[PDB]
């Protein structure tokens, strides 16, 4: 009677090991080797318009100059998807011969079939490599692009009670359906890791966080080898409270506890926490700013106008809508909800469109 | 250097008559004879045939609640392309007795828009067109008004220690249009203002629309029978806040930009709508969210039925349409759009609004 095959597995794991923390449930829903969302089955910015990849390609050129124009620049992308974003970025960079020949592309992709389509699309370009993990990428100054990477990492949640903060968990309800629950005992020194203000939250407040593992790795690399990383995702600028754990459907948001393994899950990225982690180990944070402000400062409006002027009526209309979806607000536009933050080698004092005020 | 011809006209009028009230600026941007917006596919009926079909079936429920009148006027205010009415009629066609009891009446002021509707429904008889709601012959009826109220000029006032001053449009330093405040307060504005809103701090914005249209609609059903269905973007309880915006194809925009070339809107106050109806003897039902309304009418089952028999692409189009109409997030309107019914006081409940 279980809604999905994974649901059956989860319920069994709960009866066997006890309440399952939210982060674990999200991890299983997305990565189960047999029933994960990714293992089994165009809204992203690069799929929406060629302009996204092109502009990040040109932003990468600005970083190259800020890094003293290294003869070898590693252009690393974490989670290339179909490889569309990289194709567009490379096409824009091809216009600058010197830099184009100083590039070495490194796409980190764990999935096989996903790695294959990426290989056929970029089959024509030389100096392109694939890696199972960020760690396998050769050393050297780099430009790291991470679009929607952090938003799909398992989210950890805790709820404020008289006794302190207890981890939020998943349990089995009366009808045998999955439900949200609260851990028996509070997390030891949780308050000691919370931003001062959040400590004064009233009962029932929900605090969300993710371990700093990934950001520390990315921040360590640029600090040690040079360059900068660009992180783009749905999130907020200041650490705060609130539950943002949701399933994402094609034209709306959905209940995260429904159809485990068959739904794409997400949670806001805390850009305040990302910046702090970067600074804690010596790397320099830039921004953060809204996606809309970032792209407009890079000249997306002028590029859009140029493409519209030379396009057929329908394509021109498609470009105009793409511009709004990428930089405006309302009706599902992501210009305000998506944010951008840069993390660089401390030697680099400013990054274009982020801290060049 | 003016963005449009209307912008120029607005400048002149401001220099000649003084600051222009927000409601007057919107009225001009939308209806100027030669420079208005309406004189120059995101609506629910254009998104799916299901919207019109379900309202057609809801209309049948009202017919039964009104004791099955032998003649039921089916009035639509602002039929757009006439798509919604074509879908409603197709669903009603399945019920012969009621279908023959229908007399369709579309209120359309625009000529070319009236023509498109005529071509689309040229095949059905007992269909009539009217310049205004007042031209429609008397008799029991079901009145359907989708997005009619959200495009009526919005009035705005700002709270100051000296009282509430009407919000107006002025000319800035660079000759651009800007928001301003009237010099003197509105006389007895605090009266007839929701008690709570009266305690608003300075800078609070209150929005309202005269009750002319809703009073005409409400007295009609009170006097002749039937009910009206009003669907629009809005809120359930009177409150404060500026919601005056221009509507673009994939986002919202600055209302003071390109006057006459942008579709303008403001939240409909469903609380005020209900109060006006009740103030003259009519009965308000609901209001509820569009999402809850359509789900209660069985939209999920109809959608499933349609996708089971459709090609892969059409099936996908139906699934997305269901979300846009009933869910929330990513631009879905199931939560932001609300629905309210207003009926002959004799009708005590309306399906999906006050039956639960």
XYZ file of C-alpha atoms in Angstrom:
713
model
C 0.000 0.000 0.000
C 3.083 2.215 0.289
C 3.021 5.167 -2.120
C 6.406 4.165 -3.572
C 9.054 1.468 -3.337
C 11.339 3.779 -1.353
C 8.509 4.628 1.043
C 8.389 0.947 1.997
C 12.128 0.949 2.650
C 11.946 4.097 4.797
C 9.096 2.821 6.979
C 11.044 -0.388 7.575
C 14.139 1.607 8.543
C 12.084 3.653 11.000
C 10.571 0.677 12.795
C 14.070 -0.820 12.919
C 16.267 2.165 13.853
C 13.754 4.628 15.266
C 12.804 8.150 14.048
C 14.705 9.179 10.902
C 16.207 12.700 10.878
C 14.993 14.945 8.060
C 18.428 15.195 6.433
C 18.594 11.387 6.182
C 15.156 11.152 4.581
C 16.073 13.756 1.949
C 19.367 11.976 1.295
C 17.577 8.679 0.657
C 14.802 10.250 -1.430
C 17.416 11.733 -3.734
C 20.299 9.267 -3.724
C 19.041 5.744 -3.051
C 21.101 3.560 -5.480
C 17.894 1.797 -6.512
C 14.987 4.129 -5.759
C 16.593 7.563 -5.529
C 15.148 10.487 -7.480
C 18.320 10.821 -9.543
C 18.931 7.097 -10.057
C 15.464 6.975 -11.605
C 14.235 10.015 -13.538
C 14.587 22.612 -18.316
C 13.681 24.892 -15.421
C 17.344 25.642 -14.676
C 18.777 28.975 -15.862
C 21.035 27.531 -18.598
C 18.154 25.561 -20.124
C 16.014 28.709 -20.044
C 18.481 30.777 -22.070
C 21.877 30.592 -23.750
C 22.524 34.018 -22.204
C 23.125 32.555 -18.730
C 26.079 30.404 -19.748
C 27.467 33.132 -22.020
C 27.496 35.740 -19.262
C 29.102 33.389 -16.715
C 31.661 32.716 -19.429
C 32.472 36.418 -19.607
C 32.436 36.760 -15.796
C 35.008 33.955 -15.755
C 37.194 36.101 -18.019
C 37.091 38.917 -15.430
C 38.261 36.488 -12.742
C 41.101 35.346 -15.002
C 42.309 38.951 -15.090
C 41.866 39.360 -11.323
C 43.974 36.208 -10.842
C 46.845 37.770 -12.820
C 45.940 35.874 -16.006
C 47.319 32.381 -15.278
C 48.584 30.518 -18.362
C 46.459 27.586 -17.295
C 42.990 28.241 -15.903
C 40.883 25.348 -14.658
C 37.226 25.918 -15.541
C 35.407 23.594 -13.158
C 31.696 22.911 -13.085
C 30.063 20.961 -10.287
C 26.911 19.302 -11.594
C 26.984 20.034 -15.384
C 23.487 18.639 -15.932
C 23.249 18.251 -19.717
C 26.381 20.329 -20.248
C 24.336 23.110 -21.839
C 25.681 25.836 -19.532
C 29.301 24.934 -20.327
C 28.706 24.868 -24.082
C 27.346 28.409 -23.980
C 30.136 29.665 -21.712
C 32.788 28.189 -24.003
C 31.143 29.706 -27.076
C 31.380 33.183 -25.512
C 34.979 32.610 -24.401
C 35.943 31.352 -27.874
C 35.761 35.026 -28.869
C 38.933 35.703 -26.830
C 41.681 33.509 -28.437
C 44.384 33.962 -25.776
C 42.178 33.001 -22.814
C 40.379 30.278 -24.758
C 43.686 28.461 -25.279
C 44.610 28.909 -21.605
C 41.560 26.884 -20.549
C 41.276 23.316 -19.299
C 37.675 22.232 -18.689
C 36.802 19.899 -15.814
C 33.240 18.689 -15.354
C 32.540 16.814 -12.139
C 29.765 14.335 -12.869
C 28.976 11.197 -10.867
C 26.099 9.942 -13.041
C 27.096 7.877 -16.122
C 24.350 8.529 -18.682
C 24.411 12.173 -17.623
C 28.158 12.111 -18.257
C 27.508 10.643 -21.701
C 25.135 13.280 -23.069
C 27.614 15.888 -21.823
C 30.330 14.081 -23.787
C 28.384 14.089 -27.066
C 27.442 17.764 -26.793
C 31.022 18.857 -26.119
C 32.637 16.088 -28.179
C 34.026 18.723 -30.528
C 36.049 20.688 -27.974
C 39.567 19.765 -26.849
C 40.950 20.011 -23.297
C 37.780 18.803 -21.571
C 37.780 16.215 -18.783
C 35.379 14.408 -16.460
C 35.785 13.571 -12.775
C 33.841 11.524 -10.219
C 34.523 14.078 -7.497
C 35.811 17.594 -6.870
C 38.922 16.012 -5.336
C 39.999 14.390 -8.628
C 40.301 17.704 -10.486
C 43.956 18.620 -11.217
C 45.443 21.521 -9.238
C 45.947 25.099 -10.384
C 44.148 28.496 -10.437
C 40.461 28.031 -11.221
C 36.972 29.387 -11.832
C 34.407 27.138 -10.152
C 30.780 27.353 -11.221
C 28.120 25.766 -8.996
C 24.535 26.357 -10.141
C 21.863 24.807 -7.925
C 24.402 22.438 -6.337
C 23.931 23.393 -2.685
C 20.124 23.465 -2.783
C 19.900 19.699 -3.300
C 22.302 18.756 -0.482
C 20.448 17.187 2.514
C 18.966 19.834 4.837
C 19.249 19.457 8.646
C 16.463 20.904 10.818
C 15.945 21.529 14.541
C 12.961 22.854 16.522
C 13.062 25.117 19.596
C 11.521 23.750 22.801
C 11.672 24.626 26.508
C 14.410 22.017 26.893
C 16.370 23.327 23.917
C 16.671 22.448 20.230
C 15.575 18.933 19.215
C 16.364 17.499 15.782
C 13.344 17.321 13.489
C 12.611 13.768 12.360
C 10.370 11.600 10.202
C 7.983 9.107 11.836
C 5.012 6.915 10.928
C 1.572 8.371 11.570
C -1.690 6.708 12.555
C -2.641 5.755 8.993
C 0.867 4.472 8.355
C 1.788 7.608 6.415
C 5.047 9.536 6.906
C 4.867 12.511 9.263
C 7.164 15.105 10.839
C 8.261 14.527 14.423
C 10.642 15.819 17.088
C 13.615 14.016 18.649
C 13.315 12.865 22.264
C 16.398 14.661 23.593
C 17.805 18.087 22.615
C 21.068 18.555 20.718
C 23.914 19.107 23.258
C 25.757 22.322 22.429
C 23.459 23.424 19.619
C 22.885 26.976 20.883
C 26.649 27.504 20.865
C 26.727 27.155 17.083
C 23.688 29.355 16.376
C 23.961 33.002 15.360
C 23.279 35.133 18.493
C 19.835 36.322 17.358
C 18.480 32.859 16.473
C 19.218 31.837 20.078
C 16.329 34.074 21.189
C 13.791 32.286 18.980
C 10.421 31.424 20.563
C 9.177 27.826 20.943
C 8.285 26.179 17.645
C 10.838 28.083 15.575
C 12.637 25.960 12.976
C 16.349 26.424 12.288
C 17.894 24.960 9.123
C 21.546 24.162 8.435
C 23.873 21.968 6.374
C 27.325 20.651 7.372
C 30.073 22.877 5.952
C 31.885 19.985 4.248
C 31.326 20.975 0.609
C 31.836 24.715 1.014
C 35.020 24.152 3.058
C 36.446 22.018 0.219
C 35.583 24.598 -2.423
C 36.836 27.476 -0.278
C 40.062 25.587 0.556
C 40.879 24.969 -3.100
C 40.650 28.617 -4.258
C 42.416 29.808 -1.105
C 45.314 27.412 -1.754
C 45.431 27.264 -5.571
C 43.851 30.551 -6.651
C 40.820 31.840 -8.514
C 37.223 31.968 -7.319
C 33.965 30.059 -7.072
C 30.529 31.321 -8.086
C 27.609 29.825 -6.176
C 24.052 30.408 -7.429
C 20.955 29.035 -5.696
C 17.535 29.662 -4.184
C 18.074 31.070 -0.690
C 18.363 33.950 1.782
C 21.032 36.521 2.679
C 20.849 36.399 6.490
C 20.632 33.349 8.764
C 17.132 33.144 10.203
C 14.334 30.731 11.087
C 11.640 29.011 9.048
C 10.916 25.702 7.340
C 11.758 25.767 3.607
C 11.913 22.003 2.955
C 9.708 21.321 -0.098
C 9.298 19.023 -3.090
C 9.472 20.772 -6.463
C 6.914 19.954 -9.152
C 6.890 21.178 -12.769
C 4.578 24.144 -12.110
C 4.296 24.416 -8.326
C 5.734 23.308 -4.979
C 4.570 20.117 -3.272
C 4.515 18.245 0.049
C 7.998 16.780 0.678
C 6.605 13.667 2.392
C 4.589 12.560 -0.656
C 5.919 10.054 -3.204
C 9.402 9.515 -1.709
C 11.982 8.917 -4.429
C 9.781 10.288 -7.211
C 10.011 13.957 -6.283
C 12.779 16.531 -6.542
C 13.398 17.961 -3.053
C 14.944 21.267 -1.973
C 15.544 23.722 0.886
C 16.869 27.286 0.943
C 20.608 27.738 0.909
C 21.817 29.891 3.828
C 24.147 32.298 1.984
C 25.106 33.890 5.341
C 26.374 30.495 6.562
C 28.229 29.928 3.251
C 30.054 33.249 3.582
C 30.956 32.592 7.223
C 32.361 29.135 6.504
C 34.487 30.581 3.699
C 35.862 33.359 5.916
C 36.470 30.928 8.827
C 39.289 29.238 6.928
C 40.842 32.269 5.254
C 38.953 32.538 1.933
C 37.190 35.782 0.942
C 33.412 36.056 0.489
C 31.900 38.492 -2.056
C 28.325 39.736 -2.077
C 25.923 38.035 -1.821
C 23.443 39.675 -4.227
C 20.222 38.715 -6.003
C 20.480 36.818 -9.298
C 18.610 39.676 -10.943
C 21.105 42.291 -9.792
C 24.064 40.045 -10.662
C 22.985 39.402 -14.279
C 21.860 42.968 -14.910
C 25.255 44.257 -13.777
C 26.815 41.827 -16.292
C 24.777 43.428 -19.083
C 22.058 40.817 -19.699
C 19.549 43.495 -20.785
C 21.800 44.721 -23.632
C 22.594 41.174 -24.778
C 18.878 40.308 -24.758
C 18.022 43.387 -26.848
C 20.699 42.470 -29.420
C 19.374 38.930 -29.794
C 15.766 40.148 -30.033
C 16.604 42.678 -32.764
C 17.963 39.888 -34.985
C 15.476 37.129 -34.125
C 12.232 35.925 -35.701
C 9.057 37.152 -33.963
C 8.543 34.008 -31.863
C 12.184 33.668 -30.832
C 12.287 37.369 -29.961
C 9.302 36.773 -27.692
C 11.030 33.742 -26.155
C 14.104 35.863 -25.402
C 12.020 38.615 -23.773
C 10.324 36.111 -21.472
C 13.635 34.444 -20.622
C 15.040 37.821 -19.559
C 12.139 38.307 -17.132
C 12.315 34.776 -15.676
C 16.037 35.253 -15.022
C 15.971 38.771 -13.568
C 12.499 39.870 -12.505
C 10.114 39.077 -9.655
C 6.572 37.745 -9.496
C 4.761 35.104 -11.562
C 7.520 32.613 -10.796
C 10.415 34.834 -11.915
C 13.581 33.970 -9.984
C 15.523 37.254 -10.055
C 14.853 37.989 -6.364
C 14.638 34.504 -4.817
C 17.877 33.145 -6.326
C 21.050 34.637 -4.841
C 24.694 34.742 -5.899
C 27.839 34.651 -3.764
C 31.488 34.540 -4.747
C 34.307 32.985 -2.728
C 37.897 33.650 -3.685
C 41.594 33.517 -3.035
C 42.065 36.192 -0.343
C 44.524 37.918 -2.702
C 41.546 38.827 -4.920
C 39.917 41.794 -3.182
C 36.845 42.274 -5.376
C 34.789 40.342 -7.897
C 32.766 41.890 -10.715
C 29.061 42.441 -9.996
C 29.479 41.220 -6.400
C 31.872 43.478 -4.488
C 33.014 46.011 -7.099
C 30.759 48.738 -5.694
C 11.763 62.009 -24.179
C 8.406 60.731 -22.877
C 7.923 56.954 -22.997
C 4.477 57.130 -24.627
C 1.937 59.564 -26.039
C -0.269 58.958 -23.011
C 2.644 59.851 -20.736
C 2.777 63.209 -22.512
C -0.966 63.699 -22.096
C -0.702 62.822 -18.395
C 2.051 65.422 -17.946
C -0.120 68.139 -19.469
C -3.116 67.175 -17.340
C -0.961 67.266 -14.208
C 0.480 70.699 -14.967
C -3.035 71.906 -15.773
C -5.149 70.304 -13.029
C -2.627 69.475 -10.329
C -1.568 66.083 -8.882
C -3.492 63.192 -10.444
C -5.166 60.641 -8.115
C -3.805 57.102 -8.469
C -7.225 55.816 -9.570
C -7.422 58.399 -12.386
C -3.942 57.486 -13.653
C -4.872 53.789 -13.839
C -8.195 54.613 -15.500
C -6.334 56.560 -18.194
C -3.566 53.983 -18.682
C -6.151 51.305 -19.378
C -9.044 53.033 -21.122
C -7.853 56.136 -22.964
C -9.789 56.230 -26.299
C -6.638 56.497 -28.416
C -3.791 55.680 -26.028
C -5.290 53.259 -23.507
C -4.035 49.707 -22.980
C -7.237 47.890 -23.933
C -7.403 50.084 -27.036
C -3.653 49.782 -27.560
C -3.117 33.751 -22.583
C -2.404 33.693 -18.859
C -6.082 33.688 -17.857
C -7.502 30.444 -16.455
C -9.788 29.643 -19.418
C -6.925 30.011 -21.899
C -4.758 27.775 -19.714
C -7.288 24.936 -19.763
C -10.662 23.886 -21.146
C -11.275 22.479 -17.652
C -11.881 25.909 -16.091
C -14.837 26.756 -18.322
C -16.251 23.227 -18.119
C -16.288 23.222 -14.319
C -17.928 26.645 -14.065
C -20.476 25.309 -16.540
C -21.242 22.473 -14.152
C -21.209 24.826 -11.138
C -23.814 26.905 -13.000
C -26.006 23.797 -13.182
C -25.851 23.505 -9.374
C -26.994 27.117 -9.045
C -29.853 26.384 -11.453
C -31.077 23.666 -9.087
C -30.647 25.944 -6.061
C -32.793 28.568 -7.828
C -35.588 25.997 -8.266
C -34.770 25.204 -11.917
C -36.096 28.324 -13.705
C -37.369 27.636 -17.244
C -35.157 30.453 -18.460
C -31.705 30.944 -16.979
C -29.700 33.925 -18.142
C -26.023 32.978 -18.322
C -24.202 36.297 -18.132
C -20.473 36.793 -18.490
C -18.809 40.137 -17.817
C -15.673 40.429 -19.924
C -15.746 37.226 -22.036
C -12.317 37.985 -23.512
C -12.067 35.711 -26.565
C -15.195 33.789 -25.595
C -13.156 30.661 -24.860
C -14.481 30.272 -21.304
C -18.105 30.395 -22.480
C -17.466 27.861 -25.252
C -16.098 25.361 -22.741
C -18.920 26.000 -20.273
C -21.570 25.476 -22.962
C -19.898 22.280 -24.170
C -20.136 20.831 -20.644
C -23.749 21.992 -20.245
C -24.687 20.446 -23.617
C -24.542 17.064 -21.841
C -27.678 18.072 -19.891
C -30.432 18.598 -22.544
C -33.214 20.022 -20.318
C -31.000 22.721 -18.782
C -29.195 23.444 -22.048
C -32.498 24.382 -23.718
C -33.336 26.598 -20.727
C -30.254 28.757 -21.363
C -30.054 32.250 -22.825
C -26.446 33.390 -23.170
C -25.560 37.041 -22.607
C -22.076 38.433 -23.060
C -21.222 41.968 -22.001
C -18.488 43.296 -24.251
C -17.724 46.967 -24.860
C -14.864 46.374 -27.315
C -15.925 45.750 -30.958
C -13.185 43.527 -32.406
C -13.142 41.500 -29.201
C -16.908 41.122 -29.567
C -16.335 39.893 -33.127
C -13.889 37.144 -32.151
C -16.460 35.860 -29.664
C -19.141 35.916 -32.378
C -17.050 33.789 -34.750
C -16.195 31.230 -32.079
C -19.797 30.839 -30.923
C -21.387 31.533 -34.310
C -22.715 27.982 -34.230
C -24.831 28.276 -31.078
C -28.199 30.035 -30.933
C -29.714 31.984 -28.030
C -26.537 34.031 -27.613
C -26.636 37.816 -27.242
C -24.185 40.706 -26.893
C -24.572 43.839 -24.767
C -22.770 47.170 -24.373
C -23.245 47.035 -20.616
C -24.490 44.823 -17.783
C -27.586 47.035 -17.670
C -28.680 46.044 -21.201
C -29.208 42.392 -20.219
C -32.886 41.361 -20.096
C -34.288 40.515 -16.659
C -34.719 37.046 -15.188
C -32.925 34.527 -12.897
C -29.241 34.170 -13.741
C -25.732 32.901 -13.187
C -23.224 35.730 -13.552
C -19.594 34.829 -14.193
C -16.911 37.483 -13.664
C -13.318 36.299 -14.112
C -10.669 38.973 -13.517
C -13.230 41.784 -13.971
C -12.685 43.564 -10.641
C -8.877 43.503 -10.648
C -8.701 45.864 -13.638
C -11.075 48.513 -12.221
C -9.178 51.669 -11.069
C -7.735 51.305 -7.557
C -8.022 54.172 -5.021
C -5.228 54.595 -2.455
C -4.723 56.654 0.715
C -1.703 57.120 3.001
C -1.881 57.451 6.788
C -0.469 60.654 8.289
C -0.842 62.122 11.783
C -3.196 64.656 10.215
C -5.326 61.899 8.706
C -5.498 59.941 5.449
C -4.358 61.802 2.307
C -5.182 60.442 -1.143
C -2.199 59.020 -2.992
C -1.456 60.861 -6.234
C 0.857 60.982 -9.236
C 3.293 63.879 -9.692
C 6.225 64.843 -11.903
C 9.727 64.375 -10.532
C 12.891 66.377 -11.143
C 13.860 64.545 -14.333
C 10.306 64.893 -15.614
C 9.484 61.308 -14.663
C 6.190 60.226 -13.094
C 6.367 59.692 -9.332
C 4.060 58.839 -6.428
C 2.910 61.715 -4.243
C 0.528 62.633 -1.439
C -2.452 64.994 -1.420
C -2.081 68.261 0.502
C -5.226 67.935 2.616
C -6.647 64.792 4.279
C -9.874 63.095 3.212
C -12.706 64.507 5.415
C -14.501 61.567 7.020
C -12.225 58.824 5.721
C -11.676 57.136 9.101
C -15.415 56.501 9.266
C -16.597 53.558 7.149
C -13.012 52.249 7.379
C -12.529 48.832 8.996
C -12.055 49.534 12.750
C -8.673 47.780 12.875
C -7.239 49.609 9.855
C -7.949 52.861 11.722
C -5.124 52.026 14.141
C -2.587 51.856 11.301
C 0.744 53.647 11.832
C 1.845 56.530 9.568
C 2.846 55.443 6.076
C 0.288 52.644 5.953
C -1.452 52.317 2.587
C -5.158 51.525 2.376
C -6.715 50.500 -0.948
C -10.345 50.513 -2.022
C -12.685 50.728 -5.007
C -16.107 52.418 -5.105
C -18.892 49.847 -4.698
C -20.729 50.790 -7.922
C -20.168 47.572 -9.900
C -20.624 45.084 -7.066
C -23.781 46.911 -5.954
C -25.260 46.594 -9.471
C -24.385 42.906 -9.629
C -25.613 42.183 -6.093
C -28.930 44.008 -6.473
C -29.585 42.223 -9.772
C -29.429 38.717 -8.218
C -31.256 39.927 -5.102
C -34.067 41.320 -7.258
C -34.214 38.725 -10.052
C -32.638 35.562 -8.655
C -29.609 33.372 -9.207
C -26.025 34.055 -8.192
C -22.788 35.659 -9.292
C -19.324 34.096 -9.228
C -16.392 36.469 -8.850
C -12.831 35.180 -9.306
C -9.738 37.364 -9.021
C -6.324 37.969 -7.467
C -6.890 39.277 -3.938
C -7.175 38.869 -0.166
C -9.861 37.609 2.229
C -9.657 40.289 4.943
C -9.439 44.080 4.566
C -5.928 45.200 5.463
C -3.158 47.591 4.434
C -0.464 47.510 1.768
C 0.273 48.734 -1.744
C -0.536 46.123 -4.422
C -0.745 48.398 -7.486
C 1.536 46.810 -10.128
C 1.922 46.469 -13.885
C 1.681 42.911 -15.210
C 4.277 41.600 -17.666
C 4.306 38.275 -19.529
C 6.621 36.572 -17.025
C 6.840 38.945 -14.056
C 5.421 42.049 -12.368
C 6.646 45.537 -13.266
C 6.690 49.193 -12.170
C 3.197 50.685 -12.745
C 4.599 54.141 -13.507
C 6.567 52.787 -16.495
C 5.272 53.034 -20.087
C 1.725 54.225 -19.294
C -0.779 52.938 -21.833
C 1.415 50.005 -22.873
C 1.220 47.976 -19.677
C -1.573 45.915 -18.165
C -2.214 47.260 -14.644
C -3.694 45.581 -11.569
C -4.317 45.730 -7.813
C -5.648 43.189 -5.322
C -9.386 42.847 -5.083
C -10.604 43.224 -1.471
C -12.956 40.213 -1.152
C -13.919 41.337 2.382
C -15.200 44.673 1.009
C -16.956 42.855 -1.843
C -18.833 40.652 0.631
C -19.729 43.602 2.870
C -21.179 45.596 -0.023
C -23.305 42.616 -1.083
C -24.655 42.099 2.443
C -25.251 45.853 2.916
C -28.072 45.774 0.369
C -29.715 42.459 1.180
C -27.785 39.999 -1.030
C -25.971 36.975 0.472
C -22.196 36.442 0.315
C -20.710 32.935 0.099
C -17.134 32.031 0.938
C -14.742 33.455 -0.035
C -12.241 30.618 -0.652
C -9.049 30.144 -2.675
C -9.306 29.239 -6.368
C -7.382 26.078 -5.513
C -9.878 24.915 -2.907
C -12.829 25.918 -5.117
C -11.752 23.944 -8.204
C -10.594 20.930 -6.189
C -14.019 20.725 -4.525
C -15.624 20.769 -7.992
C -13.586 17.693 -8.931
C -10.871 19.192 -11.162
C -8.329 16.510 -10.170
C -10.572 13.650 -11.407
C -11.392 15.451 -14.665
C -7.690 16.117 -15.244
C -6.767 12.447 -14.676
C -9.520 11.350 -17.033
C -8.179 13.710 -19.715
C -4.534 12.687 -19.365
C -5.353 8.955 -19.444
C -6.719 9.406 -22.984
C -4.254 12.021 -24.264
C -0.996 11.797 -26.203
C 2.173 12.164 -24.087
C 2.645 15.900 -24.745
C -1.005 16.802 -24.245
C -1.031 14.723 -21.067
C 1.943 16.732 -19.801
C 0.187 19.987 -20.724
C -2.883 18.960 -18.717
C -0.829 18.046 -15.643
C 0.911 21.423 -15.645
C -2.400 23.211 -16.209
C -3.823 21.500 -13.109
C -0.918 22.794 -11.000
C -1.098 26.368 -12.354
C -4.809 26.507 -11.527
C -4.717 24.873 -8.100
C -1.265 24.734 -6.552
C 1.091 27.318 -5.086
C 4.644 28.392 -5.844
C 6.444 28.936 -9.166
C 3.671 31.267 -10.328
C 0.764 28.881 -9.615
C -2.407 30.809 -8.734
C -4.397 28.362 -6.595
C -3.588 30.314 -3.438
C -3.414 33.948 -4.644
C -6.689 33.902 -6.624
C -9.855 33.817 -4.504
C -13.496 33.054 -5.269
C -16.644 34.573 -3.767
C -20.298 33.976 -4.541
C -23.112 36.514 -4.148
C -26.689 35.339 -4.416
C -30.375 35.951 -4.058
C -30.833 35.843 -0.265
C -33.314 32.978 -0.780
C -30.368 30.762 -1.790
C -28.735 29.750 1.501
C -25.666 27.830 0.269
C -23.588 27.554 -2.894
C -21.533 24.504 -3.882
C -17.825 24.611 -3.006
C -18.254 27.951 -1.197
C -20.643 27.601 1.749
C -21.861 23.994 1.551
C -19.186 22.737 3.948
